[PDB]
């Protein structure tokens, strides 16, 4: 079983991706790339993240969008000044009432983008690097059969990852323990995949997408790339516990484990996915099928 | 957000079954024994720096409140055993505790075997790695068993300098919220200081290793519900800081043990970087779902 994990690391994991922007542009072969940054009250960092991606716009990157979740700070104006198009949840999907959480935002962005490849990057990153998007799309553009690329960081993967996500995957989807940072917010997917899967709510969205991709398309459809060295963030334990509880709920939903829906005396828990976007945007989805 | 059924049960359970100031006297607890005896068991594996200090805090109760004080050694190669002897405990190996079954590793094994080596109607477990143990731990743990009708399991919790560690708050409590939400009322489900009746403890399987504490909690709940479980504040203690690799192994076994009790299959695949023992009443020695 380590054999399986070893072969996947050899073929589908890159600790030192060699790719240049020019090489990746030349491999697009008519595919387009959308970059989506979810954001809720991230005025201090959103501009910095956008600025690292904007030089790619009109070359490797075809669309650069911040999907705002109802910010009351200066997230929107700062994102626009840095060169992103800012799209509210309402504009993205106007006839569906918004619900809270990160998964909602990523799901809605599927209705507001046109890329054959969609790249998600968190807007709260303090130290963004311009090669994030290139590294995330490399396996999609240059390998065959890859549909989901997970960006990981080498450390000088926190406690929810090592105490909650990885041990639960060992128990319930054992091959997926090969993924170093299953909860990471920097990842890219094909339109084919992303338009066809339900989206878990809130903090469950990443693990839900990983597990659904694994089940439907298989291990070799998942890759991972090192984006560089980054220190662990230090979120308050109460935030980490709320994240954990939702990771549990989402994994339980994907396994059919009855989850009570009871949160932590503090926490938000939802067991209800949003449906595949191709059910609500069938014509958009069909237009984007190759 | 209105109160949930879990919230309502928690509120009343805390009122009836939790003590922030478990101030019973040793004398009144002794007077309440009413012929019951009390055994204290310290599981130990290579704890030479601390085992004697724990024993020393309990020894004054020996011959009064406490009838026997046993260190159940798990195969130490340091001076754990002789330090426990000099400090005034009875040292019993796994093999002497239960000669007819070959040992397997882990804490749960040690606690299970201690049921065959003890005679008390109440058994108290105290970790042997405690740095600051307080002499009132045992009195506080046995109080609800001696004085409160219907209680079979007492969990000792600590206040923290100005709840649990990372495995408790990220793994155990969130999984209980999902699978057994009434049990989220227990502040420190993974705690190593707890007491139970012989009647309860002989009747449940014992999970291996790092799963033993939460396995006992869930098996007690599944048999008797919240009414049979209590908790008591043992005092203020700083969080221990264990290495992440140990915390990850603890988490993986907590998950396995919860899954085995809650109808979830488990791959058996340990962390990418041992079975339950049957009730001791199968070897030594009502709460109806119908009407």
Give the closest of B6, B166, B264 to A257, CB-based.
Answer: B264
Give the closest of B10, B167, B178 to A259, CB-based.
Answer: B178
Whole-angstrom Cα distance, residue B206 to residue B278?
A: 7
- State whether residue A5 sits within 8 Å of chain B by CB: yes
In the structure, how many helices (H) and strands (E) does chain B have? 12, 8
- Which residues from A are below 8 Å from B270, CB to CB? 170
Asked, for residue B166, whether it belongs to a domain, the answer is yes
In chain B, the residue whose alpha carbon lies closest to the alpha carbon of A178 is B272
What residues does B247 pair with on adjacent strands? none
Whole-angstrom Cα distance, residue A248 to residue A254?
A: 10
In chain A, the residue whose alpha carbon lies closest to the alpha carbon of B174 is A245
- CB burial of A63-96 (b: ≥16 within 10 Å; e: otherwise) equals bbbbbbbebeeebbebbeebebebbbbeebbeee
Q: Are A241 and B184 a contacting pair at CB < 8 A?
A: no
Cβ neighbours of residue B196 closer than 8 Å, sequence gap 6 or more = B122, B123, B145, B152, B153, B154, B216, B220
- Whether A51 and A84 have beta carbons less than 8 Å apart is answered as no
Q: Are A264 and B184 a contacting pair at CB < 8 A?
A: yes
- Which residues from B are below 8 Å from A237, CB to CB? 166, 169-170
Asked, for residue B290, whether it belongs to a domain, the answer is no
Asked, for residue B153, whether it belongs to a domain, the answer is yes
- Whether A100 and A202 have beta carbons less than 8 Å apart is answered as yes
Whole-angstrom Cα distance, residue B238 to residue A30?
A: 60
Tokens, residue B278:
């049957």
- Secondary structure in 3-state letters for chain A: CHHHHHHHHHHHEECCCCCCHHHHHHCCCCCCEEEEEEECCCCCCHHHHHHHHHHHECCCECEEEEEECCCCCCHHHHHHHCCCEEEEHHHHCCCCCCCCCHHHHHHHHCCCCCCCEEEECCCCCCCCCCCHHHHHHHHHHHCCCCCEEEEEEECCCCHHHHHHHHHHHHHHCHHHHHCCCCCCCCEEEEHHHHCCCCECCHHHHHHHHHHHHHHHHCHHHEEEEEEEECCCCCCCHHHHHHHHHHHHHHHHHHHCCCCCCCCCCCCCCCCCCECCHHHCCHHHHHHCCC
- Whether A117 and A188 have beta carbons less than 8 Å apart is answered as yes
- State whether residue A259 sits within 8 Å of chain B by CB: yes
Asked, for residue B288, whether it belongs to a domain, the answer is no
Whole-angstrom Cα distance, residue A74 to residue B207?
A: 53
How many domains are there within chain B?
Answer: 1
Interface test with B, best of A241, A242, A246, A255 (most B CBs within 10 A): A241
- State whether residue A180 sits within 8 Å of chain B by CB: no
- Among B291, B184, B106, B135, CA closest to A245: B184
Which technique was used to obtain these atomic coordinates? X-ray
Whichever domain contains A34, its CATH number is 3.90.550.10
- Whether B114 and B43 have beta carbons less than 8 Å apart is answered as yes
Are β-strands B90-93 and B153-159 bridged in parallel, bridged antiparallel, or unpaired? unpaired
- Among B62, B109, B112, CA closest to B90: B62
- State whether residue A234 sits within 8 Å of chain B by CB: no
From the annotation, which residues of A make up the binding site for Mg(2+)? 42, 124
Whole-angstrom Cα distance, residue B108 to residue B201?
A: 12
- For residue A147, give its domain range: 1-288
């Amino acid at each position: 079983t380590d054999l399986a994990r070893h072969r996947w690391l050899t073929d589908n994991s890159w600790t030192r991706p060699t790719w240049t922007v020019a090489e990746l542009e030349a491999a697009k072969a008519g595919r387009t790339i959308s970059v989506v940054l979810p954001a809720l009250n991230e005025e201090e960092t959103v501009g910095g993240v956008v600025e690292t991606i904007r030089p790619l716009l009109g070359g490797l990157v075809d669309e650069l969008i911040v999907l705002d979740s109802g910010s009351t700070d200066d997230t929107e104006i700062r994102a626009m000044a840095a060169g992103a198009r800012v799209i509210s949840r309402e504009v993205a999907l106007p006839e569906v009432a918004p619900q809270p959480g990160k998964g909602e935002v990523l799901w809605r962005s599927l209705a507001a983008t046109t890329g054959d490849i969609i790249v998600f990057i968190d807007s709260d990153l303090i130290d963004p690097d311009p090669m994030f998007v290139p590294k995330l799309v490399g396996p999609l553009l240059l390998s065959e059969g890859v549909h989901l690329v997970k960006g990981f960081y080498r450390r000088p993967g926190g406690r929810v990852t090592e105490l909650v996500a990885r041990p639960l995957l060992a128990a319930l989807r054992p091959e997926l323990t090969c993924v170093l940072q299953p909860l990471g917010g920097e990842y890219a997917g094909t339109r084919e995949l992303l338009m066809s899967v339900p989206f878990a709510p809130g903090y469950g969205v990443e693990i839900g997408l990983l597990v659904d991709t694994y089940d439907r398309l298989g291990l070799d459809a998942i890759a991972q790339v090192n984006l560089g060295v980054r220190a662990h963030r230090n979120r308050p334990l109460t935030d980490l516990a709320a994240m954990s509880r939702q990771v549990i709920a989402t994994l339980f939903s994907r396994c059919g484990v009855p989850d009570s829906g009871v949160g932590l005396t503090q926490s938000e828990v939802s067991l209800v996915d949003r449906p595949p976007m191709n059910t609500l945007r069938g014509k958009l989805a069909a237009a984007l099928e190759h």
